[PDB]
Amino acid sequence: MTEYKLVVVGAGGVGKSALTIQLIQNHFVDEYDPTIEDSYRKQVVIDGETCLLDILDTAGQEEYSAMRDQYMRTGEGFLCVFAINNTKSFEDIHQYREQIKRVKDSDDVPMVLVGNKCDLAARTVESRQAQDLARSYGIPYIETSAKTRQGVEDAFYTLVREIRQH
Ligand SMILES: Nc1nc2c(ncn2[C@@H]2O[C@H](COP(=O)(O)OP(=O)(O)NP(=O)(O)O)[C@@H](O)[C@H]2O)c(=O)[nH]1
Ligand SMILES: [Mg+2]
């Protein structure tokens, strides 16, 4: 069966792991647990297709920035995650996108932009500005809450749709 290799990227603390663990394990992790690099896999149904989703969950922290090139080689699609209450994370998106393109030697790598933590009243990044960013990249935008699981499947499964359409 098709295996889609998805890589979750973005600044520290935005919810990469929370998104990942929601998808794979159906639990919200409220714990503080910075990532170095973790791999997950789950058989899922996407648009009727029973397939394997591999997720590589990556570090947002400064010190595991040198690891990026390797995982950006190997991934097929990238969830570029920021948090809608953290405008710095939204700005940091651009650097993750550019790095992915550099490594893959391609301006058109399967990606999605994900505004996570939409459950939080304290939004600082407007949905419109994030849609606009995604549009400037020619990729889908998905808003999510890893807390409630709202949009979680949408985020990973829209990325699988991008990989299929490349
Ligand atoms: N309210 C809310 N909190 C969230 C959401 N997603 C993650 N969090 C919380 O935000 C904190 C950091 O989330 P985590 O998944 O560790 O982020 P990360 O991007 O994987 N961190 P790292 O870059 O260090 O690996 C955790 O306390 C987590 O519970 C969300 O959608 N809503
Ligand atoms: Mg993490």
Side-chain angles (χ1 to χ4, degrees), residues 37-163:
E37 200 163 285
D38 297 323
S39 291
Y40 296 81
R41 51 108 186 114
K42 188 176 176 47
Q43 180 181 289
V44 298
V45 181
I46 302 171
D47 301 326
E49 183 192 23
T50 296
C51 56
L52 212 292
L53 247 62
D54 301 340
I55 301 159
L56 184 72
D57 180 27
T58 70
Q61 70 185 109
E62 146 180 38
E63 38 278 17
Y64 296 138
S65 39
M67 298 178 82
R68 295 191 189 125
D69 290 1
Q70 286 161 301
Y71 74 62
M72 297 172 165
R73 273 154 179 251
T74 294
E76 288 169 349
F78 300 78
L79 289 103
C80 294
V81 188
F82 67 94
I84 60 77
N85 71 333
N86 177 355
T87 66
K88 184 62 169 169
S89 72
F90 182 59
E91 307 166 30
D92 295 337
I93 283 306
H94 175 85
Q95 290 299 102
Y96 274 106
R97 171 160 171 95
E98 290 303 313
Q99 192 175 12
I100 294 165
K101 289 165 48 191
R102 194 165 295 119
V103 175
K104 296 207 80 79
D105 291 303
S106 173
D107 290 344
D108 186 23
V109 177
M111 303 192 201
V112 297
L113 182 66
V114 176
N116 188 41
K117 313 201 183 182
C118 288
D119 60 287
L120 293 179
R123 179 180 285 269
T124 62
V125 182
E126 295 297 57
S127 297
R128 188 190 141 192
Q129 86 196 77
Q131 294 167 152
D132 287 349
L133 184 63
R135 192 177 306 113
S136 71
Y137 297 163
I139 71 185
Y141 182 50
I142 303 94
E143 278 192 359
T144 63
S145 178
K147 184 158 198 157
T148 71
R149 204 168 194 277
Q150 202 75 328
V152 172
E153 285 177 11
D154 287 340
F156 289 86
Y157 293 3
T158 294
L159 182 52
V160 165
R161 294 162 192 123
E162 292 298 292
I163 291 162

